[PDB]
Amino acid sequence: NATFGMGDRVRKKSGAAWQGQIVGWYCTNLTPEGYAVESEAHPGSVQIYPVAALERIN
Amino acid sequence: NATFGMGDRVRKKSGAAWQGQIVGWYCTNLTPEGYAVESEAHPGSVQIYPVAALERIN
Amino acid sequence: NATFGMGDRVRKKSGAAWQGQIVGWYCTNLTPEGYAVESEAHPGSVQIYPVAALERIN
Amino acid sequence: NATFGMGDRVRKKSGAAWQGQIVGWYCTNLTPEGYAVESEAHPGSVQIYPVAALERIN
Ligand SMILES: NC(=O)c1ccc[n+]([C@@H]2O[C@H](COP(=O)([O-])OP(=O)(O)OC[C@H]3O[C@@H](n4cnc5c(N)ncnc54)[C@H](OP(=O)(O)O)[C@@H]3O)[C@@H](O)[C@H]2O)c1
Ligand SMILES: NC(=O)c1ccc[n+]([C@@H]2O[C@H](COP(=O)([O-])OP(=O)(O)OC[C@H]3O[C@@H](n4cnc5c(N)ncnc54)[C@H](OP(=O)(O)O)[C@@H]3O)[C@@H](O)[C@H]2O)c1
Ligand SMILES: NC(=O)c1ccc[n+]([C@@H]2O[C@H](COP(=O)([O-])OP(=O)(O)OC[C@H]3O[C@@H](n4cnc5c(N)ncnc54)[C@H](OP(=O)(O)O)[C@@H]3O)[C@@H](O)[C@H]2O)c1
Ligand SMILES: NC(=O)c1ccc[n+]([C@@H]2O[C@H](COP(=O)([O-])OP(=O)(O)OC[C@H]3O[C@@H](n4cnc5c(N)ncnc54)[C@H](OP(=O)(O)O)[C@@H]3O)[C@@H](O)[C@H]2O)c1
């Protein structure tokens, strides 16, 4: 393997913004490595994205 | 009717947080009055909610 | 304007699938023409997409 | 522990419908046990829900 681990701070690289903590994972044929990210601005709200859409930040 | 109009600043009342501008509307049998809200923290990201989940703020 | 109107049957052109009825609209700088679509397979569930992601079907 | 495992067929118990396979997991304070579910009707589309919202089916 995984690019990210639980608790890593990540953001969407482009397009619609999203930033916060890795809180989970998923895997489909379309998205064989995906992550759930809890917004650091909006506690409790989670969005899921393919790994290629995300980048780790400090 | 409508409780909110385009551009109103709203937030989710409870549970998962969300806050920003009304940017659209939807209507289903389950949700006969729903709104699209663009996060003020994460430009471009939009989430949809029933009217009862939202409250207007200044 | 609008490409679609309320009640039009549409589907996602590519990637993750989605198909059902137009039930609403939204507009942001990133997505100046977007639509809410209620799944015809999963009543009550709605997802939002830019116009370019959707195509009308009979 | 987990209520469900990868590949279990589940559906939303009430409200907006969703049905398909468990494809992932997430954990937040609001949702300490959550699941990602890929629709069996719309390949590639995934939605996330708390465990209490879901039930396993054959
Ligand atoms: N709104 C959007 O467009 C959007 C997009 C992407 C992600 N999300 C994410 O979805 C999450 C919403 O969080 P939340 O605090 O509102 O809700 P939640 O606690 O994540 O619950 C989600 C939904 O599950 C159902 N549910 C929850 N508890 C249940 C129970 N005990 N029994 C039966 N059904 C139950 C309800 O479904 P019904 O509503 O069908 O009744 C509820 O609205 C956030 O993480 C958000 O980011 C939302
Ligand atoms: N991730 C979540 O859990 C979640 C939950 C609720 C709401 N949302 C919302 O969804 C939005 C995502 O925004 P965004 O900037 O990533 O993407 P977007 O511009 O809103 O595009 C959405 C999706 O539509 C498809 N698409 C876009 N342009 C296309 C084109 N020209 N031709 C064919 N298909 C096209 C792509 O589908 P495919 O990916 O299928 O290729 C793309 O990922 C945000 O407003 C976000 O809040 C996300
Ligand atoms: N799960 C996903 O990943 C995802 C992604 C994209 C779109 N969606 C869409 O989101 C919708 C979920 O439908 P649904 O039947 O579960 O739920 P809903 O009726 O659309 O309610 C959505 C959320 O709004 C809040 N809410 C609703 N009524 C409230 C009230 N009376 N007072 C305070 N808050 C209230 C709850 O928030 P909290 O959960 O914060 O308590 C609830 O989970 C579907 O249309 C689905 O497609 C979900
Ligand atoms: N639309 C909704 O309301 C909603 C609600 C809940 C869940 N969802 C879920 O979100 C998923 C959408 O699937 P999908 O096939 O459209 O898209 P995807 O492959 O899951 O990609 C999601 C988004 O990530 C970004 N992205 C993907 N690849 C990228 C790359 N190589 N570089 C930079 N950014 C990249 C794009 O963001 P941008 O659009 O920001 O450019 C894209 O729209 C489905 O599983 C669906 O159920 C959608």
Coordinates of C-alpha atoms and ligand atoms in Angstrom, one line a residue:
Chain A
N1 CA 2.2 -3.0 -0.9
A2 CA 0.0 0.0 0.0
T3 CA 1.0 3.6 -0.9
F4 CA -0.6 5.0 2.2
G5 CA -1.3 3.9 5.7
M6 CA -3.9 4.8 8.3
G7 CA -3.4 8.3 9.6
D8 CA -1.4 9.6 6.7
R9 CA -2.4 13.2 5.8
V10 CA -3.3 13.4 2.1
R11 CA -4.9 15.7 -0.4
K12 CA -6.5 15.4 -3.8
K13 CA -3.9 16.3 -6.4
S14 CA -6.3 18.2 -8.8
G15 CA -9.9 19.1 -9.5
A16 CA -12.2 19.1 -6.5
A17 CA -10.3 19.6 -3.3
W18 CA -10.1 17.2 -0.4
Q19 CA -7.6 17.0 2.5
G20 CA -7.4 15.0 5.7
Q21 CA -6.5 11.6 7.1
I22 CA -6.5 8.2 5.6
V23 CA -9.3 6.3 7.5
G24 CA -9.8 3.3 5.3
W25 CA -9.3 1.4 2.0
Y26 CA -11.2 -0.2 -0.8
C27 CA -10.5 -2.3 -3.9
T28 CA -12.5 -2.8 -7.0
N29 CA -11.5 -3.8 -10.6
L30 CA -11.9 -0.1 -11.6
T31 CA -10.0 1.1 -8.5
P32 CA -7.7 -1.7 -7.3
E33 CA -6.1 0.6 -4.7
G34 CA -8.5 3.1 -3.2
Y35 CA -8.6 5.1 0.0
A36 CA -11.1 6.6 2.4
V37 CA -10.1 10.1 3.6
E38 CA -11.8 12.0 6.5
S39 CA -11.8 15.7 5.9
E40 CA -9.7 17.7 8.4
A41 CA -12.0 20.6 7.8
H42 CA -15.3 18.7 8.1
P43 CA -15.0 16.1 10.9
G44 CA -16.9 12.9 10.1
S45 CA -17.2 13.4 6.4
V46 CA -15.4 10.8 4.4
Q47 CA -14.8 10.6 0.7
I48 CA -13.2 7.7 -1.3
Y49 CA -10.7 8.1 -4.1
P50 CA -8.2 6.0 -6.2
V51 CA -4.6 6.2 -5.1
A52 CA -3.7 8.1 -8.3
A53 CA -5.9 11.0 -7.2
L54 CA -4.1 11.5 -3.9
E55 CA -0.8 12.7 -2.6
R56 CA 0.7 12.6 0.9
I57 CA 1.5 15.9 2.6
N58 CA 3.1 16.7 6.0
Chain B
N1 CA -41.5 27.3 -1.9
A2 CA -37.7 26.6 -1.3
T3 CA -36.1 26.9 2.1
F4 CA -32.8 27.9 0.6
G5 CA -31.6 29.8 -2.4
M6 CA -28.4 29.7 -4.5
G7 CA -25.5 31.2 -2.6
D8 CA -26.9 30.8 0.9
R9 CA -24.3 29.7 3.4
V10 CA -25.4 26.5 5.1
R11 CA -24.1 23.8 7.3
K12 CA -25.1 20.3 8.3
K13 CA -26.9 20.4 11.6
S14 CA -25.5 17.2 13.1
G15 CA -23.3 14.2 12.4
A16 CA -20.8 14.5 9.7
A17 CA -19.9 18.1 9.1
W18 CA -20.3 20.1 5.9
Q19 CA -20.4 23.8 5.4
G20 CA -20.5 26.1 2.3
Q21 CA -22.7 27.5 -0.4
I22 CA -25.9 26.2 -1.9
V23 CA -25.0 25.4 -5.5
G24 CA -28.0 23.3 -6.6
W25 CA -31.1 21.3 -5.8
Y26 CA -32.6 17.9 -6.3
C27 CA -35.9 16.1 -5.7
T28 CA -36.8 12.5 -5.2
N29 CA -39.6 10.7 -3.4
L30 CA -37.2 10.0 -0.5
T31 CA -35.9 13.6 -0.5
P32 CA -38.5 15.9 -2.0
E33 CA -36.4 18.9 -1.1
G34 CA -32.7 18.5 -1.4
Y35 CA -29.7 20.7 -1.9
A36 CA -26.2 20.6 -3.3
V37 CA -23.6 22.3 -1.2
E38 CA -20.1 23.2 -2.2
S39 CA -17.6 23.1 0.6
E40 CA -16.1 26.4 1.6
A41 CA -13.0 24.5 2.8
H42 CA -12.6 22.2 -0.2
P43 CA -13.4 24.2 -3.4
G44 CA -15.1 22.1 -6.1
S45 CA -16.3 19.4 -3.8
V46 CA -20.0 19.1 -3.6
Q47 CA -22.3 17.0 -1.4
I48 CA -26.0 16.6 -1.5
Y49 CA -28.4 16.6 1.5
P50 CA -32.1 16.8 2.4
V51 CA -33.3 20.1 3.6
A52 CA -33.9 18.8 7.1
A53 CA -30.2 18.1 7.5
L54 CA -29.1 21.7 6.8
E55 CA -29.3 25.1 8.4
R56 CA -28.5 28.5 7.1
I57 CA -25.8 30.5 8.8
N58 CA -24.4 34.0 8.1
Chain C
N1 CA -29.4 26.3 -22.1
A2 CA -29.5 22.9 -20.2
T3 CA -28.4 19.7 -21.9
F4 CA -30.8 17.6 -19.9
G5 CA -34.1 18.1 -18.2
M6 CA -35.9 16.6 -15.2
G7 CA -36.9 13.0 -15.8
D8 CA -34.5 12.4 -18.7
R9 CA -32.9 8.9 -18.5
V10 CA -29.2 9.1 -18.5
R11 CA -26.1 7.0 -17.9
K12 CA -22.5 7.6 -17.1
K13 CA -20.5 7.3 -20.3
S14 CA -17.4 5.6 -18.9
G15 CA -15.7 4.4 -15.7
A16 CA -18.0 3.7 -12.8
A17 CA -21.5 3.0 -13.9
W18 CA -24.6 4.9 -13.0
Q19 CA -28.0 5.0 -14.7
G20 CA -31.4 6.5 -13.9
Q21 CA -33.3 9.8 -13.9
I22 CA -32.3 13.4 -13.8
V23 CA -33.6 14.7 -10.4
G24 CA -31.7 17.9 -10.0
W25 CA -28.9 20.2 -11.0
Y26 CA -25.9 22.0 -9.7
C27 CA -23.3 24.6 -10.7
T28 CA -19.8 25.3 -9.5
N29 CA -16.7 26.9 -11.1
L30 CA -15.3 23.4 -11.6
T31 CA -18.6 22.0 -12.8
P32 CA -20.7 24.8 -14.3
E33 CA -23.3 22.4 -15.6
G34 CA -23.9 19.4 -13.3
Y35 CA -26.8 17.0 -12.7
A36 CA -28.2 14.9 -9.9
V37 CA -29.2 11.4 -11.1
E38 CA -31.4 9.0 -9.1
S39 CA -30.4 5.3 -9.7
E40 CA -33.1 3.3 -11.5
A41 CA -31.6 0.2 -9.7
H42 CA -31.3 1.6 -6.2
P43 CA -34.3 3.9 -5.5
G44 CA -33.5 6.9 -3.4
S45 CA -29.8 6.9 -4.1
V46 CA -28.6 9.9 -6.0
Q47 CA -25.2 10.8 -7.4
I48 CA -24.0 14.0 -9.0
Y49 CA -22.0 14.4 -12.1
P50 CA -20.8 17.0 -14.6
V51 CA -22.7 17.0 -17.9
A52 CA -19.7 15.7 -19.8
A53 CA -19.8 12.5 -17.8
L54 CA -23.4 11.7 -18.8
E55 CA -25.4 10.7 -21.9
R56 CA -29.1 10.5 -22.5
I57 CA -30.6 7.1 -23.3
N58 CA -34.2 6.0 -24.1
Chain D
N1 CA -14.1 -8.3 15.3
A2 CA -15.7 -7.2 11.9
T3 CA -19.3 -7.8 11.1
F4 CA -18.7 -8.3 7.4
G5 CA -15.8 -9.5 5.3
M6 CA -14.6 -8.8 1.8
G7 CA -17.0 -10.2 -0.8
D8 CA -20.1 -10.4 1.5
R9 CA -23.3 -9.4 -0.3
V10 CA -25.0 -6.7 1.6
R11 CA -27.8 -4.2 1.3
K12 CA -28.9 -1.0 3.0
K13 CA -31.6 -1.7 5.5
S14 CA -33.7 1.4 4.9
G15 CA -33.9 4.7 3.1
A16 CA -31.9 5.0 0.0
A17 CA -31.2 1.7 -1.5
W18 CA -27.8 0.1 -2.2
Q19 CA -26.8 -3.5 -2.7
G20 CA -23.6 -5.3 -3.7
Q21 CA -20.3 -6.5 -2.4
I22 CA -18.2 -5.4 0.5
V23 CA -15.0 -4.0 -1.1
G24 CA -13.4 -2.2 1.7
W25 CA -13.6 -0.7 5.2
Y26 CA -13.2 2.6 7.1
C27 CA -13.1 3.9 10.6
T28 CA -13.8 7.3 12.1
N29 CA -15.0 8.5 15.5
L30 CA -18.4 9.1 14.0
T31 CA -18.4 5.7 12.2
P32 CA -16.0 3.4 14.0
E33 CA -17.0 0.4 11.8
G34 CA -17.8 1.4 8.2
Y35 CA -17.8 -0.5 4.9
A36 CA -17.3 0.3 1.2
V37 CA -19.9 -1.5 -1.0
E38 CA -19.6 -1.8 -4.8
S39 CA -23.1 -1.8 -6.4
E40 CA -24.0 -5.1 -8.1
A41 CA -26.1 -3.0 -10.5
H42 CA -23.6 -0.3 -11.4
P43 CA -20.1 -1.9 -11.7
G44 CA -17.4 0.4 -10.3
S45 CA -19.6 2.6 -8.2
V46 CA -18.8 2.4 -4.5
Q47 CA -20.6 3.9 -1.6
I48 CA -19.6 3.9 2.1
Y49 CA -21.8 3.3 5.1
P50 CA -21.8 2.6 8.8
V51 CA -22.2 -1.1 9.7
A52 CA -25.6 -0.3 11.3
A53 CA -27.0 0.8 7.9
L54 CA -26.2 -2.6 6.3
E55 CA -27.4 -6.1 6.4
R56 CA -25.9 -9.3 4.8
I57 CA -28.0 -11.2 2.3
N58 CA -27.3 -14.4 0.3
Ligands
LIG1 N1 -24.0 13.6 0.6 C1 -23.0 13.2 -0.3 O1 -23.2 13.6 -1.5 C2 -21.9 12.4 0.0 C3 -20.9 12.0 -1.0 C4 -19.8 11.2 -0.6 C5 -19.7 10.8 0.7 N2 -20.6 11.2 1.6 C6 -20.3 10.7 2.9 O2 -21.3 10.0 3.6 C7 -21.2 10.3 5.0 C8 -22.4 10.8 5.6 O3 -22.2 10.9 7.0 P1 -23.4 11.0 8.1 O4 -22.9 11.4 9.5 O5 -24.4 11.8 7.5 O6 -24.2 9.6 8.0 P2 -23.7 8.2 8.4 O7 -23.7 8.1 9.9 O8 -22.4 7.9 7.6 O9 -24.9 7.3 7.9 C9 -25.0 7.2 6.5 C10 -26.4 6.7 6.1 O10 -26.5 5.4 6.6 C11 -27.9 5.1 7.0 N3 -27.9 4.7 8.5 C12 -27.1 5.2 9.4 N4 -27.4 4.6 10.6 C13 -28.4 3.7 10.4 C14 -29.1 2.9 11.2 N5 -28.7 2.8 12.5 N6 -30.0 2.1 10.7 C15 -30.4 2.2 9.4 N7 -29.7 3.0 8.5 C16 -28.7 3.8 9.0 C17 -28.7 6.4 6.8 O11 -29.2 6.1 5.5 P3 -30.3 6.9 4.6 O12 -29.9 8.3 4.5 O13 -30.6 6.1 3.4 O14 -31.5 6.8 5.6 C18 -27.6 7.4 6.8 O15 -27.9 8.6 6.1 C19 -20.0 11.3 5.2 O16 -18.8 10.6 5.5 C20 -20.0 11.9 3.8 O17 -18.7 12.5 3.4 C21 -21.7 11.9 1.3
LIG2 N1 -15.5 10.4 -3.5 C1 -16.6 10.5 -2.8 O1 -16.8 9.6 -2.0 C2 -17.7 11.5 -3.1 C3 -18.9 11.5 -2.3 C4 -19.9 12.5 -2.5 C5 -19.6 13.5 -3.5 N2 -18.5 13.4 -4.2 C6 -18.3 14.5 -5.1 O2 -18.0 14.2 -6.4 C7 -17.2 15.3 -7.0 C8 -15.9 14.8 -7.5 O3 -15.3 16.0 -8.2 P1 -14.2 15.9 -9.3 O4 -13.4 17.2 -9.6 O5 -13.4 14.7 -8.8 O6 -14.8 15.1 -10.6 P2 -15.9 15.7 -11.5 O7 -15.3 16.7 -12.4 O8 -17.1 16.0 -10.6 O9 -16.1 14.4 -12.4 C9 -16.8 13.3 -11.7 C10 -16.6 12.0 -12.5 O10 -17.4 12.1 -13.7 C11 -16.7 11.5 -14.8 N3 -16.3 12.4 -15.9 C12 -15.9 13.7 -15.7 N4 -15.6 14.3 -16.9 C13 -15.8 13.3 -17.8 C14 -15.7 13.4 -19.2 N5 -15.3 14.5 -19.8 N6 -16.0 12.2 -19.9 C15 -16.4 11.1 -19.2 N7 -16.6 11.1 -17.9 C16 -16.2 12.2 -17.2 C17 -15.5 10.8 -14.1 O11 -16.0 9.5 -13.8 P3 -15.2 8.2 -13.4 O12 -14.5 8.4 -12.1 O13 -16.3 7.1 -13.3 O14 -14.3 8.0 -14.5 C18 -15.2 11.7 -12.9 O15 -14.5 11.0 -11.9 C19 -17.0 16.3 -5.8 O16 -18.0 17.4 -6.0 C20 -17.2 15.5 -4.6 O17 -17.6 16.1 -3.4 C21 -17.5 12.5 -4.0
LIG3 N1 -22.4 6.8 1.0 C1 -21.8 7.4 0.0 O1 -20.7 7.2 -0.3 C2 -22.5 8.3 -1.0 C3 -21.9 8.9 -2.1 C4 -22.6 9.8 -2.9 C5 -23.9 10.0 -2.7 N2 -24.5 9.4 -1.7 C6 -25.9 9.7 -1.5 O2 -26.4 10.2 -0.3 C7 -27.8 9.8 -0.2 C8 -28.0 9.0 1.1 O3 -29.4 8.8 1.2 P1 -30.1 8.4 2.6 O4 -31.5 7.9 2.5 O5 -29.1 7.6 3.3 O6 -30.0 9.7 3.6 P2 -30.6 11.1 3.4 O7 -32.0 11.0 3.7 O8 -30.1 11.6 2.0 O9 -29.9 11.9 4.6 C9 -28.5 12.2 4.4 C10 -27.9 12.5 5.7 O10 -28.4 13.8 6.1 C11 -28.5 13.9 7.5 N3 -30.0 14.0 7.9 C12 -31.0 13.5 7.3 N4 -32.2 13.9 7.9 C13 -31.8 14.7 9.0 C14 -32.5 15.3 9.9 N5 -33.9 15.2 9.9 N6 -31.8 16.0 10.9 C15 -30.5 16.1 10.9 N7 -29.8 15.5 9.9 C16 -30.4 14.7 9.0 C17 -28.0 12.5 8.0 O11 -26.6 12.9 8.2 P3 -25.4 12.2 9.0 O12 -25.2 10.8 8.4 O13 -24.2 13.1 9.1 O14 -26.1 12.0 10.4 C18 -28.2 11.6 6.8 O15 -27.3 10.5 6.8 C19 -28.1 8.9 -1.4 O16 -28.8 9.7 -2.3 C20 -26.7 8.4 -1.8 O17 -26.6 8.1 -3.2 C21 -23.9 8.6 -0.8
LIG4 N1 -21.0 11.4 -7.7 C1 -21.3 11.2 -6.4 O1 -22.2 11.9 -5.9 C2 -20.7 10.1 -5.6 C3 -21.1 9.9 -4.3 C4 -20.6 8.8 -3.5 C5 -19.7 8.0 -4.1 N2 -19.3 8.3 -5.4 C6 -18.3 7.3 -5.9 O2 -17.1 7.9 -6.5 C7 -16.7 6.9 -7.5 C8 -16.5 7.6 -8.9 O3 -15.9 6.7 -9.7 P1 -15.2 7.0 -11.1 O4 -14.9 5.9 -12.1 O5 -15.9 8.2 -11.6 O6 -13.9 7.9 -10.7 P2 -12.7 7.4 -9.9 O7 -11.9 6.6 -10.9 O8 -13.2 6.8 -8.6 O9 -11.9 8.8 -9.7 C9 -12.4 9.6 -8.7 C10 -11.9 11.0 -8.9 O10 -10.5 11.0 -8.5 C11 -9.7 11.9 -9.4 N3 -8.7 11.2 -10.1 C12 -8.8 9.9 -10.6 N4 -7.7 9.6 -11.3 C13 -6.8 10.6 -11.2 C14 -5.5 10.8 -11.6 N5 -4.9 9.8 -12.3 N6 -4.9 12.0 -11.3 C15 -5.6 12.9 -10.6 N7 -6.8 12.8 -10.2 C16 -7.5 11.6 -10.4 C17 -10.8 12.6 -10.3 O11 -11.1 13.7 -9.5 P3 -11.8 15.1 -9.9 O12 -13.2 14.7 -10.4 O13 -11.8 16.0 -8.8 O14 -11.0 15.5 -11.1 C18 -11.9 11.6 -10.3 O15 -13.2 12.2 -10.7 C19 -17.7 5.8 -7.6 O16 -17.2 4.7 -6.9 C20 -18.9 6.5 -7.0 O17 -19.9 5.6 -6.4 C21 -19.8 9.3 -6.1

